[PDB]
Each structure stands twice: as C-alpha cells, then as structure tokens.
Amino acid sequence: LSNSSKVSVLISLLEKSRDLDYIGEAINQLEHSLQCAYFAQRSGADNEMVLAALLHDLGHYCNDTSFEDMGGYGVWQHEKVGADYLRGLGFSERVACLIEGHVAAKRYLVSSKYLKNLSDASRKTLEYQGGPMDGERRLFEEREDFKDCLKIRAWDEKGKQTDLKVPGPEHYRKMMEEHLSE
Numbered sequence: 001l002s003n004s005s006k007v008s009v010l011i012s013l014l015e016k017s018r019d020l021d022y023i024g025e026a027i028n029q030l031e032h033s034l035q036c037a038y039f040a041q042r043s044g045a046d047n048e049m050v051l052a053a054l055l056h057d058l059g060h061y062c063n064d065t066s067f068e069d070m071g072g073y074g075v076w077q078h079e080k081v082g083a084d085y086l087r088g089l090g091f092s093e094r095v096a097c098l099i100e101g102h103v104a105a106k107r108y109l110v111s112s113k114y115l116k117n118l119s120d121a122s123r124k125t126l127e128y129q130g131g132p133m134d135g136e137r138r139l140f141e142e143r144e145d146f147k148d149c150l151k152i153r154a155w156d157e158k159g160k161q162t163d164l165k166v167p168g169p170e171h172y173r174k175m176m177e178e179h180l181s182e
C-alpha cells in the first residue's frame, strides 16, 4: 500500500532471488542484478536507468520460476513478465519499456554485429525469443529509448563478473521509493 512496503516487497523479492539456480550463468541472479545496477549508477545514468538495470531480470522469478521454459535458462518472456509486474507496482512506463526491451536489444545487436560476446546462457535463450531480428531492426531503431535499451543491454552483458563486491539491494531502497511517489 505505502511505497515503503511496496519497495520492501521488491527488496524481499530481490533478496530471495539469491537462493535460486544460476540458470546457466557464472554468478547468482541477485549478484547479476546488483552488478548491472552498479555499472549503471557509477556511470552517471539517471535513476530510471539504474532501476531498469537493477530489475531487468526480475521476470525470471517474480511470478514463477519455471526455468525449464527456455531449456533450463530462464522463464518464458521474462522481460515482459518483469515489465508487467513493475507496471503493476506503479513503476514508470519508461522503466517498464526499458526492461521489456532488453531482449529485443539482444536480438538487435546479434543481427547487427556479437554472438560471441554473449554468455552461453544468452545465446541459448535467443532461440526462445524469436532469434535474430529480421524489418524488425527498423521498428526497434524507431524506438524513442533505442540507445537507452542498447545501454541497458551493455551493462547486462557486463554484469557477470566473478568475485566482485557491489552495493546490496538496500542501497537502492530510497531510489525505488522516490520513483514510486513520482
């Protein structure tokens, strides 16, 4: 009800993501989230970008943890799942669209570059996401948040560092609450 309890629910979600399978990645899902948010904040990005980075893979676990969907590597349309969850909590359409686009961003870059820059897990999930963008690249390039999405995606591919200390979920509590009141 209050933004503080709303945020407490998300922080609780995030904290729980820690104890979940790695879904084919080198570090846990909580760690992955925290790294992207770090790279985003330390880079000067705005709070909406930082929040989108932190929460971009929420959909792998917020409504189900059916990792078998993408052959063990994640939940079906996790980008849309997480995006809709946050729209539900009251997040900006901007955050939501950035999250929803992080998969399109992958599909784009792969058609326009990079498949080697992909983790083993990410390459594999592409074949449950519509594969390489064909035409599609035009619509995606015609997105207002086009560069933004690519940015999110950049941090996404970076947030896989083994043995890296980064601020925990609580570091982001004030940031989420403000976003909500806004």
Ligand SMILES: [Fe+3]
Pocket: 056, 057, 078, 102
């Ligand atoms: Fe993802």
Ligand SMILES: [Fe+3]
Pocket: 032, 056, 057, 156
């Ligand atoms: Fe990710």
